[PDB]
Write a protein that binds this ligand. Structure first.
Ligand code: MG
Ligand code: MG
Ligand code: MG
Ligand code: MG
Ligand code: MG
Ligand code: MG
Ligand code: MG
Ligand code: MG
Ligand code: MG
Ligand code: MG
Ligand code: MG
Ligand code: MG
Ligand code: MG
Ligand code: MG
Ligand code: MG
Ligand code: MG
Ligand code: MG
Ligand code: MG
Ligand code: MG
Ligand code: MG
Ligand code: MG
Ligand code: MG
Ligand code: MG
Ligand code: MG
Ligand code: MG
Ligand code: MG
Ligand code: MG
Ligand code: MG
Ligand code: MG
Lengths: 88, 55, 271, 117, 103, 54
RNA sequence: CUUGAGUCUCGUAGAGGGGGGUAGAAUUCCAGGUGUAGCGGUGAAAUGCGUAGAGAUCUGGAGGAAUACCGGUGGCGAAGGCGGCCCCCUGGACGAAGACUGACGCUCAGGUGCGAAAGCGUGGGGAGCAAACAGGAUUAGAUACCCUGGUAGUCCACGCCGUAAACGAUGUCGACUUGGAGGUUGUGCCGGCGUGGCUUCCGGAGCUAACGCGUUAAGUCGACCGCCUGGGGAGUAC
RNA sequence: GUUUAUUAAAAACACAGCACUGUGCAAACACGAAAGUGGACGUAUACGGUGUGACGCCUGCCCGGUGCCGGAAGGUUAAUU
């Protein structure tokens, strides 16, 4: 999956601690990076149905986490989505 | 199932050794297993039936 | 790329057309064209010999190399072009010394490949070799019947032959009709299959789309008079006769081959 | 005609018939005889006694070659596997090897459907 | 940047021109920032069963740590080089620097 | 287990060339699978005979 | 706030999914070499094949389909299902010590997606097997069971179909409730002592009309959903 | 779309589509006492003959007769001697 270097970079640059690996923003960043990466894999592999399920699970989990962040704090929510370049 | 014949080894001993080799390798049984076709459902059914009879 | 046209007109309702988006779009190479005039199915006496021929679009002849005689000089394919004189496409090549020629396009050949002819040529599509250096069992096209003459077998679009044996000084081929023939082992052949396999997936669609090819209408035998065809005549729709060609020869079932000087090379009939 | 002194006996015994041939080391055949090619026709055509008779007559048919050594190759699950070997040995011959070459697919091809009897 | 076992057997009659070329392979590896961990020449051996009417073959084993694309190009070279009759590239989990059972 | 230890792999092959069951030799479950993989790797690599007929 | 839920570090086994390449055995066909009168098939027979040289045997070539042994009341998968070997891409599960977010959770009508075999459309492919079909037998008859041949189909790429005794005839999530005999996969201490996950058989209280289930419940409970209301007519008609 | 110029323009001819069949190239076939020529400067996804007539569902039973293809155990049978 995601390389150790990429995850280390995103958590050491994007979270509010040296070892912050559990915040909502960090999770959303990891899921969006993995989704963007797997888009390329699924471009050439239409008939891969047993990984489409994992991709759908990641999408749903990202949606629920963003729902929670919107419900709790809206300002940092908008900050996160503008950093990540998303719509909702 | 190759069986040779040596000096001071009579006919019947070599014949019995060849028969034992054939029995061990199960050549005739394996041939008679591929006589016809078997539905995979029947394969799994007979396998489980034998396994539950053994228990 | 077989595409079906939308039925905006009665003549376009049934049309299916094969478009290749790789053919050269401009004009052909100038020093390799000639002139031909349509005959209409008429010989030097002016009489009609073959019926249902006449008219059509004008064409020019392209000098295609069927010998590949020059050897030891690699060549690079320049581009693929459309030839109206046949059913396959032709690919212009540029030899290392500066000479250009037309060859038949094998299957899978594109611009930027390399070809080669001779006795040391590599075994890959596009090359041509005598059938004694070619591995038995392979598939070839543009075969010769006589050593030195030129490519004369399996030359249409999509066709090919297969070498099945080598009985000393000869080879045995399985032709597209199923007939097995013996040819000299010194005849050359070209590796691969001739391209444009989508030729028979084309529907002409209308009556006038066959007159662009120069094909005049066919009149049925029973629709004639007793003085014109053996089948002609009747009050209504009457046949009562064994089917025959317009000249009396039986047309449905009868064999017509008669050639005793080449029957020695026919291993078996197509049947 | 020719002298070899060591051939190879090929036995092909199936559920209905047994065919016995003798060849050279290079594969070239010399003579043959079958259980059904000996008058045993129908149900008796497969019984091992027919195999023994076929082996004996086939051995007698190769009296002009003068062979003293043999190998045997056994094929098929037919009943003619032991009787043929004994007949070959007891025909005045001498076998120095025994080998089974029955073909066995390693999967291959779908067999005919089961006989509903 | 992964470890690999590379085994190949080559025609015995070409044995006299095997050594130098494997160096080139090593060179290629060392040209692509790859690491050689072990290289043993098993030599001429009798095959367990005849391969295309041959009986002997020259077996050579190489131990590499290299990126995947270099292994891909090496595999293509092995495919086209008619001298070698067979080859096999196995991806391992760690370095296997030791004495092989052959020697 | 590796395919390069042919001497030990000899002990787990029948006379014909097959693979002995686990219950006959009493070995474990995982080692049987790894052994079978090694045997197949060696059989492809022309180190072991596929069959016995010749 | 951290006990529910999830992220990070390490490692573990696996027919989990997709793409490409490749090794052996075997049936069929084709071309050569020896050899001559049978081969094949049934309970018994013949249609069928063979003197233009079959069948048997040896060397070689082509093509297609499936991977002997290992092999397991084994393993993976949400379900249908998944098996020779190697590389590339990729999903899930699990285990020891710890760090992190702090209820972010469960179920689900509409909706979206996957979905054995057969069947359809377009284009390739065709070794074996084999609906329809042809002939030989059996029989009072035999549109079959038996025998010899054989076209769709079975194979691949794409797009449809959306059905099965699609079954554990048992909806998903969580909590509590005597035991025994095993299989498989991780970890700690000195063959033993603990500890988790998945699974097979027997059986106690309890439950059921009974058969039986029984810590993987059909036992004691909470949440949400789906479905049932006599048999034909009928899963039919509009 | 074509047709009986000058009493018949139609349901008649043609047609895209389907099938049977012949043809291995000095191709089958046609015009020629012959040489030659068309087919074709094309090579079985090509050419000739025959019937039916877009598209949809489909196309059953009969090989005695008359044709065509294949077989040769027997009978009769020309020129020749
Ligand atoms: Mg015509
Ligand atoms: Mg026509
Ligand atoms: Mg017409
Ligand atoms: Mg008229
Ligand atoms: Mg006239
Ligand atoms: Mg007339
Ligand atoms: Mg009329
Ligand atoms: Mg009438
Ligand atoms: Mg009439
Ligand atoms: Mg032969
Ligand atoms: Mg806190
Ligand atoms: Mg749900
Ligand atoms: Mg619903
Ligand atoms: Mg289809
Ligand atoms: Mg089709
Ligand atoms: Mg149900
Ligand atoms: Mg019910
Ligand atoms: Mg499970
Ligand atoms: Mg109940
Ligand atoms: Mg119980
Ligand atoms: Mg309905
Ligand atoms: Mg009009
Ligand atoms: Mg007019
Ligand atoms: Mg008029
Ligand atoms: Mg008028
Ligand atoms: Mg008509
Ligand atoms: Mg009809
Ligand atoms: Mg008739
Ligand atoms: Mg008749």
């Amino acid at each position: 999956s995601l390389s150790t270097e990429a995850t280390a970079k995103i958590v050491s640059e994007f979270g509010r601690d040296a070892n912050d690996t559990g915040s909502t923003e960090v999770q959303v960043a990891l899921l969006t990076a993995q989704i963007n990466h797997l888009q390329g894999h699924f471009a050439e592999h239409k008939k891969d149905h047993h990984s489409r399920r994992g991709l759908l699970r990641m999408v749903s989990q990202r949606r629920k986490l963003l729902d929670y962040l919107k419900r709790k704090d809206v300002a940092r929510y908008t900050q996160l989505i503008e950093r990540l370049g998303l719509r909702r | 199932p190759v069986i040779k014949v040596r000096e001071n080894e009579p006919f019947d001993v070599a014949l019995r050794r060849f028969k034992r080799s054939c029995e061990k390798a199960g050549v005739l049984a394996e041939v008679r297993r591929r006589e016809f076709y078997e539905k995979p459902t029947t394969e799994r059914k007979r396998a489980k039936a034998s396994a539950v009879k053994r228990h | 790329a077989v595409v079906k046209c939308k039925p905006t007109s009665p003549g376009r309702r049934h049309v299916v057309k094969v478009v290749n988006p790789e053919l050269h779009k401009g004009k052909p190479f100038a020093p390799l064209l000639e002139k031909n005039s349509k005959s209409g199915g008429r010989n030097n006496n002016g009489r009609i010999t073959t019926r249902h021929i006449g008219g059509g679009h004008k064409q020019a002849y392209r000098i295609v190399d069927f010998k590949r005689n020059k050897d030891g000089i690699p060549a690079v394919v320049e581009r693929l072009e459309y030839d109206p004189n046949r059913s396959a496409n032709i690919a212009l090549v540029l030899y290392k010394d500066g000479e250009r020629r037309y060859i038949l396009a094998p299957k899978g050949l594109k611009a930027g490949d390399q070809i080669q002819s001779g006795v040391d040529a590599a075994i890959k599509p596009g090359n041509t070799l005598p059938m004694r250096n070619i591995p038995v069992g392979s598939t070839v096209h543009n075969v010769e019947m006589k050593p030195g003459k030129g490519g004369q077998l399996a030359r249409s679009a999509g066709t090919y032959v297969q070498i099945v044996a080598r009985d000393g000084a000869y080879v045995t081929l399985r032709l597209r009709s199923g007939e097995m023939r013996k040819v000299e082992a010194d005849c050359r052949a070209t590796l691969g299959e001739v391209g444009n396999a989508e030729h028979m997936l084309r529907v002409l669609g209308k009556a006038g789309a066959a007159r662009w090819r120069g094909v005049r209408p066919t009149v049925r035998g029973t629709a004639m008079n007793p003085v014109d065809h053996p089948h002609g005549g009747g009050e209504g729709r009457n046949f009562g006769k064994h089917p025959v060609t317009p000249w009396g020869v039986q047309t449905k079932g009868k064999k017509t081959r008669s050639n005793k000087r080449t029957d020695k090379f026919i291993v078996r009939r197509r049947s | 005609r020719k002298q070899v002194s060591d051939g190879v006996a090929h036995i092909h015994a199936s559920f209905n018939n047994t065919i016995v041939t003798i060849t050279d080391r290079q594969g070239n055949a010399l003579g043959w005889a079958t259980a059904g090619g000996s008058g045993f026709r129908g149900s008796r055509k497969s019984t091992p006694f027919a195999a023994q008779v076929a082996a004996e007559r086939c051995a007698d048919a190769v009296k002009e070659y003068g062979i003293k050594n043999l190998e045997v190759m056994v094929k098929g699950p037919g009943p003619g596997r032991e009787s043929t070997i004994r007949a070959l040995n007891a025909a005045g011959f001498r076998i120095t090897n025994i080998t089974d070459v029955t073909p066995i697919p390693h999967x291959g091809c779908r067999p005919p459907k089961k006989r509903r009897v | 940047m992964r470890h690999y076992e590379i085994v190949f057997m080559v025609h015995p009659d070409q044995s006299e021109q095997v050594p130098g070329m494997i160096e080139r392979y090593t060179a290629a590896i060392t040209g692509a920032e790859g690491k050689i961990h072990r290289l043993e020449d098993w030599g001429r051996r009798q095959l367990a069963y005849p391969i295309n009417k041959l009986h002997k073959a020259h077996y050579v084993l190489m131990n590499v740590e290299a990126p995947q694309e270099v292994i891909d190009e090496l595999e293509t070279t092995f495919r086209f080089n008619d001298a070698v009759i067979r080859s096999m590239v196995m991806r391992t989990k760690h370095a296997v620097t030791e004495a092989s059972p052959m020697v | 287990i590796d395919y390069k230890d042919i001497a030990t792999l000899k002990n787990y092959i029948t006379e014909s060339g097959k693979i002995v069951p686990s219950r006959i030799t009493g070995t474990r479950a995982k080692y049987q699978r790894q052994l079978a993989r090694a045997i197949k790797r060696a059989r492809y690599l022309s180190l072991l005979p596929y069959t016995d007929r010749h």
